[PDB]
Amino acid sequence: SDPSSINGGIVVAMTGKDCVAIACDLRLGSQSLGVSNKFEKIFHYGHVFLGITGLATDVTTLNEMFRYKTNLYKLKEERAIEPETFTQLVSSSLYERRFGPYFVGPVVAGINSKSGKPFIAGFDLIGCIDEAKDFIVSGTASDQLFGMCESLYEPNLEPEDLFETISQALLNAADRDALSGWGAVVYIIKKDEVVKRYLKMRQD
Amino acid sequence: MDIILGIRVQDSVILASSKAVTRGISVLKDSDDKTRQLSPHTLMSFAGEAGDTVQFAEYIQANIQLYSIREDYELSPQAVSSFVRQELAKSIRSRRPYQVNVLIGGYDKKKNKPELYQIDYLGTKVELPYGAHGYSGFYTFSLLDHHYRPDMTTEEGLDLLKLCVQELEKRMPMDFKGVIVKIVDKDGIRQVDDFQAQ
Amino acid sequence: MDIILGIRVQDSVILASSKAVTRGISVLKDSDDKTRQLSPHTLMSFAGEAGDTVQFAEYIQANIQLYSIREDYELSPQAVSSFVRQELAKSIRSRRPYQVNVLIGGYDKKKNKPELYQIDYLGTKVELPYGAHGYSGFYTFSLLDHHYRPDMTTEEGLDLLKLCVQELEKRMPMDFKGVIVKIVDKDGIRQVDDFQAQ
Amino acid sequence: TQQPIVTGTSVISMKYDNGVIIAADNLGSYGSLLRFNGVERLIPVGDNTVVGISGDISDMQHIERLLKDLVTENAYDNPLADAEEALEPSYIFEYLATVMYQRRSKMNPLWNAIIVAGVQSNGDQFLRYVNLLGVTYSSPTLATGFGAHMANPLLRKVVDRESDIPKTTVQVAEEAIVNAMRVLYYRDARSSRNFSLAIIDKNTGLTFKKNLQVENMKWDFAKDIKGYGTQKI
Amino acid sequence: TTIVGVKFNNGVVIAADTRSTQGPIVADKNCAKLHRISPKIWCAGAGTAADTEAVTQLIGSNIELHSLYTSREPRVVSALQMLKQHLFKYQGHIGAYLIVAGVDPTGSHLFSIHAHGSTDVGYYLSLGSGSLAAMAVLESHWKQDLTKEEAIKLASDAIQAGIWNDLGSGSNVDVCVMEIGKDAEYLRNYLTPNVREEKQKSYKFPRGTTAVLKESIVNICD
Amino acid sequence: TSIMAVTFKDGVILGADSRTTTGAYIANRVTDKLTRVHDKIWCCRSGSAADTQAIADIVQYHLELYTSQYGTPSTETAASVFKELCYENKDNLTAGIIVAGYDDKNKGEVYTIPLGGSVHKLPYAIAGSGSTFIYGYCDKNFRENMSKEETVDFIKHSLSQAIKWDGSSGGVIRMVVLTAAGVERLIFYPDEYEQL
Amino acid sequence: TSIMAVTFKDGVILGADSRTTTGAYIANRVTDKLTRVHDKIWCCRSGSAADTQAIADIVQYHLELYTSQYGTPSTETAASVFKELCYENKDNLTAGIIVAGYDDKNKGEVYTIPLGGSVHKLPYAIAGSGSTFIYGYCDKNFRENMSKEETVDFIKHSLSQAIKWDGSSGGVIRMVVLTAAGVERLIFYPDEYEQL
Amino acid sequence: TTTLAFRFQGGIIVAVDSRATAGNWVASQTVKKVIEINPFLLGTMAGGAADCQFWETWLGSQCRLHELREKERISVAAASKILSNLVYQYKGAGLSMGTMICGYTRKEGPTIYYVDSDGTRLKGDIFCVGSGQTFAYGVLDSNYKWDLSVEDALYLGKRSILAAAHRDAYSGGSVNLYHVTEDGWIYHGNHDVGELFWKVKEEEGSFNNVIG
Amino acid sequence: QFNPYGDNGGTILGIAGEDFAVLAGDTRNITDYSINSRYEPKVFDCGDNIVMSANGFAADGDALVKRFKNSVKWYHFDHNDKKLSINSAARNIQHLLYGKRFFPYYVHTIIAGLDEDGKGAVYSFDPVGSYEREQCRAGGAAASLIMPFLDNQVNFKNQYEPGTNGKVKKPLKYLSVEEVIKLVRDSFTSATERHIQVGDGLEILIVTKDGVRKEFYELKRD
């Protein structure tokens, strides 16, 4: 009944050697009732990826708002928005609603197209930026996610290795949370190509 | 509590809505139609708070109808549902939000697919093979998880609902006075007006 | 809300009691007998809070049965009803009061007259030609004010009761899964095993 | 249910190489009124234990009576009362811990935070805390109330783990205690300039210092402070 | 959070711990809490992190415009006045607690600001949960006419008292030295005494450990 | 907080302790509660620090604008401006201000504005949590037309008693002397005043 | 209520105002707040009139029984009985009691028992709602071993300030003098003490 | 939690999940929600673990005592009523337990009693109890026949818990299966949902809400 | 109002081997944001080769351990010195806890020992005496951080055989006391990094068919 708990949902992002990964679960619940098995929580504007947990209506509203804004950006600037810049756009957009916030835990993943360096960021619901360079977590199993990442993570992982770490981090966190799970998608983001995998997991 | 069910088969979408309207200690009507036609190929069903329910539906209907006449063209189920979602999403943060849950069932003539959208009063939208609002979902979801197949005929879809209604008439505390059933397909919206004494 | 009706005709008392037991969003049972025989010619029906209902009934039953064996005698319906009232009266000012309303229907062999007692959880007793507990009375009292006659046969009483059950099935918001009907007269207590579609 | 009335602030304490030091100011507050001024909050039991109490003073006075009654009772039919069967710090503590816990469990607590300080019969230092919930713990440094927030950080700079306690002389420890008391007097609005200090040593025994004062206070820099931002004169 | 400001004979220094928290959980182990208002006016926040950041950036923006307009160096009393007036207007609801410090043409300044908008002037200040651990150190060691070296050591030791003794504070010490002579020197991770020790074991998974349902390449361009 | 203002033969003196608390913690032990709103118009603040600082800033502003248009404002005028702000916004303010100033015609004057926003002209005035403890003392010892060294003594003694009994009061005692002479600042330290 | 006890050279004196209020109504302007629990042990009561009367009556009972068996109770004994009742029943009593007595051995003694139930032996004690206004005055004027007439003056002046500021205090000042002499009841009317 | 027991031609099917929660935290996935009172008696557990665990274990002791005292096994009716009456003594103190007592005796036949902490005690052929009850009820009711084979009935039981484990956030882990006969409980094993879901999807063509 | 409960931090963790068991817990005791002690054991050898921790409210933790240590003692007196088997201890502890069902001990409690067949055994309890035997269990403040790790690294959950298409699981096996103590120290360094209440020191108790052995490791002090 606390808005950040109604639908349930986890996002995690990790950096590795010349790559980033962002993963999310697929459940959309209404309290105990599992409602949808296909609710993805990761979006992408150009090469910039946004995962959003929390109230699902806000998740949808935010994606549509950032599509809208990055489109207008691309038209005026005649280039794709960069992760660092987008982070700033997320931050100030959320703070614009300081006193009636969107109940969400946004995560940004992407590689800088000019410098090639991997970039991740998290935010709280009013736009405060978490500037960790290893991993970012969010959602109703964030506790479990922090536990997994801090144990499993190591710097400079190769994309195929990073896929294992992020997937194992997500999967095992999901499985200690009643409200998250029911499917998982992982994005592996390499400057040049993006592979998206759907995971096999417990449907309970 | 108000039963609003939707099931999407292969060539059509089927909506079933309860017929009771109950204020307090009395059932005031046993034949209420909890549905508005949005376009020749788009039907919306609704449950929720006493006043808001019909005002919202009609407000949506007038807007879609207006759009239709302005462009001499029928918006897709997907486009209609996004409109409906955005309306609810604005509403949730206004002074007095509409407390209305909806199912939108339509046939997309361009894609030749049937489409079912579940949207709650908060503006949470999802496409589903089958859907429900309120307490009824706590029974029907698992029943359809079992018996539902993606490639069913309309006639098979109507048997799946007969099962859903039966189950709700057995285990729900309240007498919802049967359901009105409507099919949305490539031809449009018709009423299977003989479902209760069937 | 639990339907509990009683009507006193000329030579008998008829008790009718809803069959559903509902906890939350689920009907757990559709054949619940909300009755206890207190003695060969006295019947008591009950409705109220979940646990106290049966616990109270069976406690009264144990007591009246104890009496019968001690005295080799059946207490008059009027004496049983007085015993029941006092038990409820003491209960209302106790630590945790019994939340049960009752109907006592009895045939008094020493006077050859049927008798109906309505007693609520407060210990409010009153003898009636017809009575009800809960919301059902809001329908049935007016119907019987109209349709009831002091000289009706048992069979006429059953028609009048059927008329009451029809009204409730039409107008009450809850599904109470029909009634179990019982007749108390000189030849004792018997159940009308067909009523749900009689 | 209940609420403290007349209260008395921190009790601060640390271990050193031979024994323990404990101090407490002599104030008894009544809300924000600095009402009473010669309140002793250090309670010597025998001559190997000092009990320091903060919180509600009426409860403190009750625990005082309990402790005296315990010395009396231990003496009864006990010819080794001042030798082998003398009250140990650890006995006094366990007793109080029991009382405090039973009291919270009855929903009627003794509204206090207590530190028991002393030296065992084998020379070992004893330093343990108990409070109104019956929570107990032990550490090279212990403080109650504000002392927990301000004395500990300072005292821990001196004795940061067990292995620092051989290394810490009486002089160093008392200096740290005396300085911590000044800092509390600077920043705790419910505190006083006068305090008692006691040292329980394995050689020296019990040294109870009364009527101590905070000295060497820095106030001179106040004259330069004008306004709250823009004002120059 | 532990933040301090210490004045010395030729300027002012500020320090902070680098832990950010969400209730009992550490979200960021090395965040920057030292914000820049203008080149030589720096700031440290406590309370709602989004509020301290935002209020710092807003006043920082307006101070720049003010500076360009007036063709003058920004003054600390200006940052102070703008901040307090903004915070007051919000009766508290913007949960920013700041130590603002800097140098300008009139000298060197150290102030604190509370969420409701009251300001205090001082020679040494601390805010945040580690506030009392840091103040215990300052009251114990502060003196008039400190050198730059002494003020850096005192500031640093105070943050440390916060790191070790306050559960809301940890990781590393950030410092910024504003001297009347030269530029502001931002000293990031001045101390790093909380290095995470080497893991007992690697948890690198054999490839193919995770079960995959289906795979696909995502398109970026147009 | 302990604040006081006292008229005497040559002008008026404002005095105050230097302690600010949040709860029982001393946020500032060297606070300057003596506030200048004009050359020879000063005030003392009690209640919310936020509120009283915001109010003193607007008054300072109004009196500066006043001077540029109409010469020096009288002390009464300054009190009226304080009162206007305190009364009109009483609901969202917790402000207890003492206004004191020296004028050539009117010599020393003291005005007290308590919580509601009423104004009172007085020979002397005391406020803040500290003041309850010195009502008896102050009433028993104040005389009209005291000398500068007498008024300093009276403020010193009173505030030291206030500081002795109130937890929310303490630190150094600050005074501002307002006469024809000029403006004089005074400070007295615990070692000095605790002895009295 | 304004109540105080002061030890001096030859014994101890208790003083009190005579006002009892319910809200702003004066239920009694001539109350005797000076209560005898033994010949030369007396007390002043504050807080709940019901609570303190009931307490005083129990103490008087205990000391009468005490005198029958063991002889004259010490003041400390009297204070201990008061504390016992007040402490053991702190969670049903709003009682603040000042105890004052005289015996040949220990001379004049004063004990104050505030709300908690704690006991405090003091050279003098003040209490009641009017006491707050005289902390400064009393601490500044009390000396040890004053004469009877000096002490009477000290209470007279202290209570008149307390009465002057506190609306719950007022009426006449009653005093009880406790010495070897003797017990002496004094009274002072507004027309005398207001002019101080 | 989800627990069910139903009566059919060939006795009783008892089926339960194995998930323990505290709030949204999954506390355990391998918990025992069935107690084996005696060779012919079973009890199920829903609601507060401790309340159930402690009072159903106690019920076991009370039943055993009856055997010694009466030289005969306790009737299901009486076993249920012991627990019923105990729970009633505690009404309003906040006990939280959903319970089924299932078993066989010669005089009664196979019998199921539902007993909760409100004091409600009911005899019936079908009960589902727990936060997942409605989900189990949906599958169970729509495929229930009196004449189901033993093999079919065990599966319908198995399938109904799966239904519930999938939809209800607070159900899951594994299915525990029991059959009660005239001779009378036999354990039909533990079935982890981790594997069972995918197996049942494959073999039955159900669960089309799930991608992949 | 008076709240009879507090929260002293503190995390505990038990893993059962084949012929051993470990019970580990950090040695830090906290109240709100302050540190009470850096070394306060909350794991205890209770006699009869059983080790115990009751974590959460330390007053209730200590009361329960005390009371159980007494159960062991009075079991010896009433049953001719019979050893108290781990399962019997579990059942006993349930009754201690349920005994206070309507004013609970506010502790998550864990016991470790060897079962009748000499196998490693771990039992865990909620505050009101619900209990289960388990292969491993974390309890306390960072339980949510450590449990999923153990699910992954002790019971190999979500780990499949490379190449088998995720259709064949990684086989569950017993771990050595060296491989267990590795997981423990790692679990705790992870927990220290992310949770403000966990730190200072780690104490592990190991139980074998020779008794109880103790091991200590320094943890981060921030």
Ligand SMILES: Cc1ccccc1CNC(=O)[C@H](CCc1ccccc1)NC(=O)[C@@H](NC(=O)c1ccc(OCc2ccccc2)cc1)[C@@H](C)O
């Ligand atoms: C049927 C049964 C039988 C065995 C195993 C599982 C179940 C199913 N059942 C649960 O999984 C329930 C669901 C939540 C639920 C709980 C109670 C009633 C209904 C639903 N969980 C629990 O009972 C867990 N404990 C707790 O939830 C708690 C127990 C004690 C607590 O103590 C808090 C406290 C302590 C002191 C003072 C005040 C509060 C807090 C949480 C236990 C699996 O660790």
Ligand SMILES: [Mg+2]
């Ligand atoms: Mg589930």
Ligand SMILES: [Mg+2]
């Ligand atoms: Mg008066």
Ligand SMILES: [Mg+2]
């Ligand atoms: Mg055994």
Ligand SMILES: [Mg+2]
């Ligand atoms: Mg930590």
